[PDB]
């Protein structure tokens, strides 16, 4: 779509089972117990939505400050603590 | 309410009436119930038998004749308390964790003689004089502690009797609660307790079930394919019986936690309600 | 040992940034309704 | 004149939305005691480790699961009595009933990751009934639900701990009182299977049946209402299961001379072996033979493989002649036969009564 | 739907009710003509 | 792979020439989090 004359950058990284698409895609739970964030996983995830307004709409409902997805105590920077409400606005990861 | 009053002896040193205010929700156990008391029978001296000190056998018999009351404040020249007793509808009531095992809520709260390591307790070498604190544990751990400590006597029995050891074991034993593990005992040596005080507890267990499990070998020889018979049938029930009465597993509190930490530390205190 | 083999990386990093914001609201921006207060006796660890 | 009991926990086994409020609630213990007391506890031959792949495929299939080992506070503490009866709904005798609550529970939850989460529960239990690890000792007993808040998949629940059912104040649904509902799966009154008169005050008891075979086990709960006494029970449940006894007693462990003691005791002229040599310097020649009797007894059914209920009270009804109500109504947006029981006090000691025989 | 309640129950209670805030509606204005500025570039006039 | 020893040297390896580790006993049924360590230097740290 960006580049209309060529279909991917890397071809390893952009198929529908590509090596970077089975490391991480959120849909087949590779690093399920792994505790530690990983910043790759927004990128890979097809992030389901449905058609109910606008695209115009969506997009100035979808930036509302969500919830984070880390921690602030460690310095590992591990996942998001189950119960922790504390949001964090997220520009730049609604426009991939 | 009904509530016990100690009274605190005259000319205590500043450093015991500075410990015995630490102890604020621990457990006593009265003799018998009066408003009034004396600070002979909350201490050891009231519990041993025969002149020698208390055996842990005895200790259990203590435990259920004796009745059991809880600390609540502390004044420089009193002492209150309040019993689990009879109907007293005792408000906010605390008590202190005594256990090094993590209580939760939900838990049943029962009493049990100090087996793992040396019991702590303030000793008053003014008056002359210490007071002993029971352990508090749960109902679903305590069955297993009193079946572990005492079959770890019978093993050093073995090792000394058999002119050979059987070493060959699986390693250390442990209790395990809450995802944390004990690990009681960890060396050989130091028999602090081996025979001094469950010595008695471990020769009568020995006796009882030997008896059990040759009675019906004696009785009907057909299981694996001058002389009373009578008396002994008697004598074995009146033994067996009576040392279930004495082994027995009675909850006295339950851990009832409001608004606070579910989970509670040795050291921390926590409200119960009277069961 | 130092070979560099026939391939190439990419990496990604997030990082986060305490920020001082700024609102406007509007002067009718919302219906607000109070209701009345409840007492709630209850026991505790030394008190109520 | 009643108390209350507050806790946090995660929503993946309780859902304080759909449950409806007076409910039974129970919890769990730490799974990580499950492994260090099935390594000591298991019979032998046995593989001890069968109960650890059963074990860590639940949480794999469980929201958080970088999150076991610490215990900090955040577990899966409470869970739901339909829960059970719907991983369970199979073993049941009322087929339509139990996998009415079973399809109802599904879909009311996520309907998406509810599926296997109760397949793995379910080997989870035949795994803990495998190394003699029953599940009567990790699951306690709150009181009805009485109050919840939720935010997302965390949730803070208060119920009651004992005393009378309507002496509570719900004060957000149209009444201020509840009543204690079930499915009508667990429900199962014995006394009028026993054919004796229901009058007066009765029982409130759970049991834990338990099924012991080679690659076949089963669990199920009920919420048996009897007028029987407190240590009675036992006799009287055991007339009812008699044939599972029976099995068990047969399939419970599959992994030698006598000696007339009271015989050569009652004759004389047998050879002695007076204290003189049992003093300690020779005593190899002074017991040399004395007897032989070539005996030992390693396979025989204990006390703990022959094992097929554990009961415990929960609760009396102090209202003679009891009129407890069966009835179809909305649980989410499926239809579930409950029973309501109304006047029930709560109290008594997690104490359970184990019926081997 | 039959009921059976003996002297007295609970659900002899319970009153709940939903209720309306009010409605809220807008009114248009109009416009003339010559009441704008652009009439001083044309001469306007009728003709039936 | 089929064998014990060479993805053992494999995470030994891998944990030479690096910071944050799994602990070495590497226990069983369990998180898997790394070993805490002393004070913090200048921020939380951010991986790659």
Same mark, same amino acid.
């Given at each position: 779509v960006a580049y209309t004359d060529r279909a991917t950058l890397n071809p390893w990284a952009s198929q529908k089972h590509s090596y970077g698409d089975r490391l991480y895609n959120g849909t087949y739970n590779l690093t399920g117990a792994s505790p530690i964030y990983s910043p790759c996983f927004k990128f890979f995830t097809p992030a389901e939505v449905n058609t109910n307004c606008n695209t115009l709409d969506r997009l100035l409902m979808e930036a509302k400050a969500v919830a984070s997805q880390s921690s602030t105590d460690t310095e590992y920077q591990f996942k998001r603590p189950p119960g922790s409400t504390e949001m964090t606005q997220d520009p730049c990861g609604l426009f991939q | 309410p009904f509530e016990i009053e100690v009274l605190l002896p005259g000319e205590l040193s500043p450093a015991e009436t500075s410990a015995l205010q630490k102890c604020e929700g621990k457990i006593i156990t009265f003799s018998t119930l009066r408003h009034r008391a004396s600070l002979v029978d909350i201490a050891l001296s009231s519990y041993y038998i025969n002149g020698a000190p208390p055996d842990t056998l005895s200790l259990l018999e203590a435990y259920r004749m004796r009745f059991a009351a809880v600390i609540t404040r502390v004044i420089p020249g009193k002492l209150l308390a309040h019993a689990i007793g009879v109907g007293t509808p005792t408000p906010g009531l605390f008590i202190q964790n005594t256990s090094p095992v993590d209580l939760c809520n939900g838990d049943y709260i029962c009493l049990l003689p100090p087996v793992f390591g040396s019991a702590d307790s303030i000793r008053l070498d003014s008056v002359g004089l210490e007071i002993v604190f029971p352990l508090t544990i749960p109902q679903t751990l305590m069955r297993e502690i009193i079946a572990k400590v005492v079959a770890r006597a019978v093993e050093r029995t073995a090792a000394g009797a058999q002119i050979l050891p059987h070493e060959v074991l699986r390693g250390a034993d442990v209790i395990c609660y809450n995802g944390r593990?004990? @690990?009681? @005992?960890?060396?050989?040596?130091?028999?602090?307790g081996s025979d001094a005080a469950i010595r008695t507890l471990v020769l009568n267990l020995m006796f009882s079930i030997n008896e059990g499990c040759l009675l019906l070998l004696a009785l009907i020889p057909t299981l694996l394919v001058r002389f009373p018979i009578y008396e002994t049938i008697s004598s074995w029930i009146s033994t067996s019986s009576r040392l279930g009465d004495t082994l027995g597993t009675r909850a006295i509190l339950r851990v009832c936690v409001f608004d606070g930490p579910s989970t509670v530390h040795p050291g921390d205190r926590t409200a119960v309600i009277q069961v | 040992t130092g070979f560099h083999p026939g391939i190439a990386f990419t990496v990604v990093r997030q990082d986060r940034f305490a920020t001082e914001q700024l609102l406007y609201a509007e002067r009718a921006s919302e219906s607000y309704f109070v209701g009345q207060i409840q007492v709630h006796h209850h026991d505790a660890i030394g008190g109520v | 004149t009643t108390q209350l009991i507050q806790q946090v926990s995660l929503t993946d086994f309780f859902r304080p939305d759909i449950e409806h409020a007076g409910s039974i609630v129970l919890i769990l213990r730490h799974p990580s005691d499950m492994i260090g007391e099935a390594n000591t506890l298991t019979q032998a031959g046995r593989d001890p480790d069968v109960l650890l792949e059963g074990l860590r495929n639940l949480f794999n299939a469980c929201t958080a699961p970088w999150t076991v080992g610490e215990g900090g506070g955040l577990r899966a503490y409470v869970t739901s009595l339909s829960f059970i009866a719907a991983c369970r709904a199979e073993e049941y005798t009322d087929k339509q009933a139990a996998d009415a609550n079973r399809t109802a529970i599904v879909s009311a939850? =996520?309907?998406?990751r509810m599926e296997t989460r109760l397949i793995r529960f379910s080997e989870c239990l035949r795994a803990m009934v495998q190394c003699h690890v029953f599940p009567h000792r990790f699951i306690s007993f709150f009181g009805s639900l009485l109050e919840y808040t939720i935010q997302d998949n965390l949730c803070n629940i208060t119920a009651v701990a #004992? =005393?009378?059912?309507?002496?509570? +104040?719900?004060? #957000?649904?149209?009444? +201020?009182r509840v009543t204690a509902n079930i499915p009508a799966c667990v429900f199962w009154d014995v006394d009028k299977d026993l054919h004796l008169s229901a009058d007066g005050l009765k029982h409130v008891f759970l049991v834990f049946v338990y099924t012991q075979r080679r690659q076949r086990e089963g669990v199920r709960l009920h919420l048996a209402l009897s007028q029987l006494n407190e240590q009675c029970f036992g006799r009287g449940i055991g007339f009812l299961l008699g044939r599972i006894r029976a099995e068990n007693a047969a399939w419970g462990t599959e992994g030698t001379r006598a000696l007339p003691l009271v015989q050569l005791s009652n004759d004389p002229t047998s050879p002695r072996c007076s204290i003189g040599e049992i003093? =300690?310097?020779?005593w190899n020649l002074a017991r040399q033979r004395l007897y032989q009797w070539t005996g030992d007894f390693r396979g025989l059914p204990t006390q703990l493989s022959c094992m097929y209920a554990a009961y415990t009270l929960i609760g009396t009804i102090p209202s003679e002649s009891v009129r407890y109500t069966r009835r179809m109504e909305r649980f989410g947006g499926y239809n579930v036969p409950t029973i309501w029981l109304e006047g029930v006090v709560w109290g008594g000691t997690n104490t359970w009564n184990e019926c081997y025989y | 739907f039959f009921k059976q309640i003996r002297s007295d129950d609970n659900s002899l209670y319970s009153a709940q009710f939903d209720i309306l805030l009010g409605t809220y509606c807008n009114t248009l204005n109009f416009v003339r003509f010559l009441e704008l500025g652009l009439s001083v570039a044309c001469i306007c006039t009728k003709f039936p | 792979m089929l064998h014990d020893n060479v993805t053992e040297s494999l995470r030994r390896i891998t944990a030479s020439g690096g910071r944050l580790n799994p602990t070495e006993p590497l226990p069983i049924f369990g998180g898997l989090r790394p070993a805490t360590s002393a004070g913090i230097a200048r921020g939380q740290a951010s991986v790659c």
């Open positions: - | 593990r004990y @690990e009681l @005992e960890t060396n050989l040596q130091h028999r602090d | - | 939850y =996520g309907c998406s #004992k =005393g009378p059912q309507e002496a509570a +104040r719900t004060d #957000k649904t149209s009444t +201020r003093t =300690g310097v020779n | - | -």
